[PDB]
Write a protein that binds this DNA or RNA. Structure first.
Ligand code: MG
Ligand code: MG
Ligand code: MG
Ligand code: MG
Ligand code: MG
Ligand code: MG
Ligand code: MG
Ligand code: MG
Ligand code: MG
Ligand code: MG
Ligand code: MG
Ligand code: MG
Ligand code: MG
Ligand code: MG
Ligand code: MG
Lengths: 258, 134, 171, 184
RNA sequence: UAUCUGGUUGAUCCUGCCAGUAGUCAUAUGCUUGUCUCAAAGAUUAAGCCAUGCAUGUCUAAGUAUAAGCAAUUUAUACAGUGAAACUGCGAAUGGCUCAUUAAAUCAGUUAUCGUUUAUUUGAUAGUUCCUUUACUACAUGGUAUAACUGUGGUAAUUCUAGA
RNA sequence: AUUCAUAAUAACUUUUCGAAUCGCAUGGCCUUGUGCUGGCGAUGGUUCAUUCAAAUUUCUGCCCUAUCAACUUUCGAUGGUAGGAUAGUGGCCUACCAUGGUUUCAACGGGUAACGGGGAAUAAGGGUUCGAUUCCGGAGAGGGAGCCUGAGAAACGGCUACC
């Protein structure tokens, strides 16, 4: 109404932030950035609610204004800077590195990666199009535009970004039998080794996916993120590796140790 | 006092704010309400840094008494504790003094009076006095 | 009377009402794009004027007590580099750094001149800024040329592979 | 603008206001368990009613239903945990026919009574209310506490109270000072 | 917790309604009111009318300071410390309130923009502009007004303003 | 799926943009001249992408009324051609042209003590009643209309006129 909104009430923020409904009227509205508002960590939730490295929103500002936190190798002093899937967070103190990946329950999980694994990232290409002066470029899922890509790169593929220069190191093609990571939908946070996809000319592609335990499920194409060949992936998968155990089997595992 | 047996749980190191965060767990049988001023001293000795770099808050006494659980922070030095701690808690321990200030309504009305004046206002002061003669 | 000012050359010595805008006298806006309707009194002089504003352009022979005997100095001196130059008309190379009008102030027994500044003056720092911006355009253009050449070399090589690929095809 | 605080009522009034049978059985329960109101009986009936509402929906489902297996075991576990459900009856069919006062058997004052310590059910309520009973190392002054068959053996007097030691009491202290001035 | 009872008859079985009965994040009202937690709250009638006071302003190392501001830096004769005012840049189109209008209208789910605008954020991205382009030319950088400010003032009054 | 992305040719423009801006660090090279190079940032800027949005838009779905059965098309109703306007599509508006469109499967008109949903109360099952109001979308700033600034307002703790 009359212009863009700037406040985000609680009970209206995305449910995967895990914000307690009481203790506050508002929620951190993610700023404009590489990732959608609906799928965004931004650091205030990450620093305080996930890592417990702050007690308030004031201490988060104190941490960020001293250039400790950085996203993709850049300081990102903004307190509500939207951090999305596959973003790499580096903290100079504690010598810790992070990669934003979804837990099997559909939530962003705290994942600690080594220094070497923080030297790259994967991005799902969204469109391959010619720029001005006939310069082709690829647009990844985090808004990164990379000029002069490989001619064999097509949409729905995954490229590897150096994160020191925006150059592409290697790319994974979208073919049957590739290890994929489900990003969005009821099957969010699952890893499933594509078997085949349905064409459905007109829109809303469908792909059939079955994980290691031979559980098959179907999700829309735009929710699929290829993360390498079957078996060894190109990133360190979080604990559980996206299995989606049933509730009956889950409690027995919780009852195994107590 | 008598079997104070201060315990700190869930201790985590936070060099980003240059401190340590832990949950203070205090047992005070036959006694009540361990009175943080004493809590800071014993907490300071355990981490042996100083008293001025130690702050505590929370400490809701359990039902029936005999126990109290709160929060505590231990900084690396006074410089960190004097730059990250809130002003309201620094004045609790005497490390800072509560600056004198008028009421909220007094400042609001004073600010609105300024809005009615364009420029510094020295020129109208002499002009008002000159017109006050006649 | 009632203080309504006299707008420059309008009409009609009777007071009127106008819609006043930016860069228009008798109105100081309090908002961006705000316009207000105020009463302004006409330019023609009438018998309802409480005061007049007069300016002397030529001096006669009789001496005024407080207009010719006494004089007041300009409060501020020039600040821009060429405004310093235009003040004295020296040259474009006479190092205007030391031609600054200074005003001593005595709060106590200590005095200081506090010469304001020379804006738009040539500084070695400014030459560095021009040097960097000029040099950056050279490297940025060259980098794209190198990147474009590498893409063309890769594109031509792949086509050569396709040329030999279909050569084996169709017997 | 803030998330509303969820609340619910925990009792159900009977449909008929006056009948001899219910007005007798309910008062028999209150007298034999030392309860202040009829609302303390309506509360158990309401709580049991929701238990048999879920157990009927589970039984009408197919055997080895993944929902029934998860929910049926969880429902039985809670009743077994607090002692309402015996160990020999875990079929989810004895849940539907447990009783009204099986829950009243596991309340604090009844169980405080059962392990001596009150020598009357009404003496247990005042002892609990007056901050004398500690379930663990913690004082519980709620007469309806529903011990969970593990804190059953840990019911004991509060250390920071008379009958546990460390002080004679309030009126005992005043009484003792009376003979002190009387002796002199 | 898938339940009914009293009332037409001298008495009976029905139709049938009246009455009773239980609940209400449905209000109001009456009598009464010891404790802890939690909590709606000028919606219904009048989107009727409002005294008063607040609710939108904002700075860094990094736009413009000779405050004829404050103090001593003393590394400084141009400034370089803090900093009123004002110019500039942003924001004021968010939030908060209310439910009068509104019956394929709004709205809910579901679609499209191969039919468009988009400050801000993030990622890329101007060697080509001495114009008769060999003296036209400042490119170690080119002009103007004005606010703040000094002083003269007008009206009873306004976040009014004029002349210098 | 395209007259798409993109490139090329011929011109056009009264002409946009293509850094006369700021802070900190002061380092290298000599024919040591205030000579030539040289870092980390801030602000700004053309185009594309991206994000925050907006506008329009497809299908299905709303309470009571026939003591509302025909309604719409003077001067816009339904559609075509062309143009103007708009950020764009479109009777959005204009000129010419055709007589079209909706309706007992309830149009149209009247009523609502009607903002719409997510929901609330009571219920064996099926339902009935309610939803101004903690969230989402809409509308308004006493009733109307008009408009400046701006990316975004028909803005009212902005302006203008009438009542
Ligand atoms: Mg609003
Ligand atoms: Mg925000
Ligand atoms: Mg009869
Ligand atoms: Mg009779
Ligand atoms: Mg009735
Ligand atoms: Mg109403
Ligand atoms: Mg940009
Ligand atoms: Mg047309
Ligand atoms: Mg037409
Ligand atoms: Mg209404
Ligand atoms: Mg609302
Ligand atoms: Mg409005
Ligand atoms: Mg009103
Ligand atoms: Mg208006
Ligand atoms: Mg108001």
């Amino acid at each position: 109404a009359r212009g863009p909104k700037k406040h985000l009430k609680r009970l209206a923020a995305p449910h995967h932030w895990l914000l307690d409904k009481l203790s506050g009227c508002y929620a951190p509205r993610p700023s404009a950035g590489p990732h959608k508002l609906r799928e965004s960590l931004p650091l205030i939730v990450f620093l305080r609610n996930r890592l417990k490295y702050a007690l308030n929103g004031r201490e988060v500002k104190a941490i960020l204004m001293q250039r400790h936190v950085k996203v993709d190798g850049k300081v990102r002093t903004d307190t509500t800077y939207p951090a999305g899937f596959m973003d790499v967070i580096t903290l100079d103190a504690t010598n810790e590195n992070f990669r934003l990946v979804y837990d099997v329950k559909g939530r962003f999980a705290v994942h600690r990666i080594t220094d070497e694994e923080a030297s790259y990232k994967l991005g799902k290409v969204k469109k391959v199009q010619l720029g001005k002066k006939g310069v082709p470029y690829v647009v990844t899922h985090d808004g990164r535009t990379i000029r002069y890509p490989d001619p064999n790169i097509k949409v729905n593929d995954t490229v590897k970004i150096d994160l020191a220069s925006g150059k592409i190191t290697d790319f994974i093609k979208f073919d049957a039998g590739k290890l994929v990571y489900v990003t969005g939908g009821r099957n969010l946070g699952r890893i499933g080794t594509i078997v085949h996809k349905e064409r459905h000319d007109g829109g809303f592609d469908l792909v059939h996916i079955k994980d290691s335990l031979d559980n098959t499920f179907v999700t829309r194409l735009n929710n699929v993120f290829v993360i390498g060949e079957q078996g060894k992936p190109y990133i360190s998968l979080p604990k559980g590796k996206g299995i989606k155990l049933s509730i009956a089997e889950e409690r027995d595992r919780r009852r195994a140790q107590q | 006092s008598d079997a104070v047996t201060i315990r700190t749980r869930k201790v985590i190191s936070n060099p980003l704010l240059a401190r340590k965060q832990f949950v203070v767990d205090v047992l005070h049988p036959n006694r009540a309400n361990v009175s943080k001023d004493e809590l800071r001293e014993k907490l300071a000795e355990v981490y042996k840094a100083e008293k001025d770099a130690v702050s505590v808050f929370g400490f809701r006494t359990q039902f029936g008494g005999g126990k109290s659980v709160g929060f505590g922070l231990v900084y690396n030095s006074v410089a960190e504790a004097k730059k990250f701690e809130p002003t309201y808690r620094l004045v609790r321990y005497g490390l800072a003094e509560k600056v004198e200030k008028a009421s909220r309504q007094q400042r609001k009305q004073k600010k609105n009076r300024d809005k009615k004046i364009f420029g510094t206002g020295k020129r109208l002061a002499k002009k008002v006095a000159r017109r006050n003669a006649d | 009377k009632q203080g309504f000012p006299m707008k420059q050359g309008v009409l009609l010595p009777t007071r009127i009402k106008l819609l006043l805008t930016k860069n228009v006298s008798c109105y100081r806006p309090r908002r961006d794009g705000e316009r207000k309707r105020k009463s302004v009194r006409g330019a023609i002089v009438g018998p309802d004027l409480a005061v007049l504003a007069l300016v002397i352009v030529k001096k006669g022979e009789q001496e005024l007590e407080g207009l010719t005997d006494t004089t007041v100095p300009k409060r501020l001196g020039p600040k821009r580099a060429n405004n310093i130059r235009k003040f004295f008309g020296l040259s474009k190379e006479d190092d205007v750094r030391d031609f600054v009008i200074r005003r001593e102030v005595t709060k106590g027994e200590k005095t200081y001149t506090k010469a304001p500044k020379i804006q738009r003056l040539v500084t070695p720092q400014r030459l560095q800024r021009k040097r960097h911006q000029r040099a950056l355009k050279v490297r940025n253009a060259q980098a794209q040329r190198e990147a474009a050449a590498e893409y063309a070399q890769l594109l031509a090589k792949r086509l050569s592979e396709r040329k030999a690929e279909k050569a084996e095809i169709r017997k | 603008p803030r998330a509303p605080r969820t609340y619910s009522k925990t009792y159900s009034t009977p449909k008929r206001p006056y009948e001899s049978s219910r007005l007798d059985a309910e008062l028999k329960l209150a007298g034999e368990f030392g309860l202040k109101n009829k609302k303390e009986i309506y509360r158990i009936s309401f709580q049991l009613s929701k238990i048999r509402r879920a157990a009927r929906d589970l039984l009408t489902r197919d055997e080895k239903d993944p929902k029934r297996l998860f929910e049926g075991n969880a429902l039985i576990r809670r009743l077994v945990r607090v002692g309402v459900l015996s160990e020999d009856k875990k079929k989810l069919d004895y849940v539907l026919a447990l009783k009204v006062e099986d829950f009243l058997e596991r309340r604090l004052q009844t169980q405080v009574y059962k392990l001596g310590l009150a020598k009357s059910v009404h003496h247990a309520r005042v002892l609990i209310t007056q901050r004398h009973i500690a379930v663990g190392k913690q004082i519980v002054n709620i007469p309806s506490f529903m011990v969970r068959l593990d804190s059953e053996k840990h019911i004991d007097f509060a250390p920071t109270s008379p009958f546990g030691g460390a002080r004679p009491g309030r009126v005992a202290r005043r009484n003792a000072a009376r003979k002190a001035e009387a002796s002199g």
